[PDB]
Design a protein around this ligand. Structure first.
Ligand SMILES: COc1cccc(C(=O)O)c1
Length: 119
């Protein structure tokens, strides 16, 4: 029932994600010199360094907010991909499955802790 435990759990999950080779295209903002039309398709860029910095600044109130930004990294990849078979997109799908598998308990524990707090 620790309402704050999600933050360190998210830090550790981000550390695992940065160790995954599949995260390399998503560690820093998409390079506009490499993909000049990126902002014509993507309205809100997102990347794992921005997520980590937001968490470390104390600018996430809950793990749901962190989860919304990580999911935005994946939806941007899906919206920008020219093919569902592209390399970078395929890496996003695996990393998404790994992230979803690990964030589930973080979200569950936080929501349960919060319900206990408001019981
Ligand atoms: C820069 O982000 C992305 C996302 C998805 C696919 C690609 C690509 O070039 O195949 C690039």
């Amino acid at each position: 029932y620790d309402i704050q435990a999600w933050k360190k759990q998210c830090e550790e999950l981000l550390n695992l994600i940065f160790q995954c080779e599949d995260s390399e295209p998503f560690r820093q903002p998409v390079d506009l010199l490499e993909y000049p039309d990126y902002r014509d398709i993507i309205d809100t860029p997102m990347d794992f360094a921005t997520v980590r910095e937001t968490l470390e600044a104390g600018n996430y109130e809950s793990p749901m907010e962190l989860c919304k930004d990580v999911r935005l990294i994946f939806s941007n990849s899906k919206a920008y991909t020219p093919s569902k078979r592209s390399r970078i997109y395929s890496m996003s799908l695996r990393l998404s499955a790994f992230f979803e598998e690990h964030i589930s308990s973080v979200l569950s524990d936080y929501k349960s802790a919060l319900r206990f707090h408001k019981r």
